[PDB]
């Protein structure tokens with residue numbers, strides 16, 4: 675997730691110069707810059723390319739041909755539209771879920787713009803991800819607890835054996851550090867169904883339209899055995 | 914005697930609701946795994962079917 679799109683060319687210099695200054699600033703924080711052509715070019719960079727999170731275009735050029743098609747594909751997609759002096763909204767842009775970030779064409783302030791895009795991208799990551807997955811990714815970069823289960827502890831025992839180094843280098847450092855048991859307090863326990871696990875079950879039930887969806891950690895073949903033992907006492911009749 | 918016994922029960926319950934602050938009503942907790950916080954009455958303490966419940970501050974219902 676590091677693709678930034680810069681659509682259209684106004685032909686002037688006071689609008690393309692901030693684009694050139696921002697081109698050298700976004701590359702310092704690992705971001706891919708793409709230059710689409712017409713309106714149909716940007717539409718192909720969203721359906722086929724899912725790793726995009728930045729759309730830069732002129733607000734006083736396509737204020738209705740882009741705010742309608744993008745809204746039909748993604749709701750929380752950041753729109754880094756650049757407005758001008760005589761700029762305003764439209765009456766047909768009230769019932770659309772969009773994230774428009776306005777800026778200016780000021781020289782020298784390209785460094786401050788790059789910090790705002792990185793912080794806005796971080797807000798997009800912390801929003802579309804559920805609180806259970808978001809807490810798991812944050813626990814790897816900060817949570818470093820000792821004397822816990824399992825015994826590998828993020829791949830520590832594999833770094834002391836020649837045969838263990840081949841198995842650790844296949845997956846990755848973030849893979850072994852994400853395998854944690856119930857020995858963590860800020861993530862809760864699955865058997866207790868509290869904390870992050872409580873809001874995770876209520877989130878799936880709202881998406882799939884249910885009351886309280888569950889998460890079986892053994893497969894479908896096991897879920898049919900737990901439900902079957904409910905409405906079937908020792909001596910009944912099932913259909 | 915039925916219309917006279919009701920006045921005795923009404924007078925008896927009038928003095929019991931005045932001192933209701935001493936004995937409240939504690940409901941047991943059992944919210945395990947369910948879509949709603951279920952509750953349950955008292956076990957051996959109450960066994961009647963049509964029991965009555967008192968209240969502190971009276972309200973204007975109906």
Ligand SMILES: *Cc1c(COP(=O)(O)O)cnc(C)c1O
Pocket residue numbers: 892893894895896
């Ligand atoms: C494939 C299948 C299963 C097994 O699914 P798993 O998640 O792999 O256990 C169980 N029930 C039905 C009807 C299936 O088609």
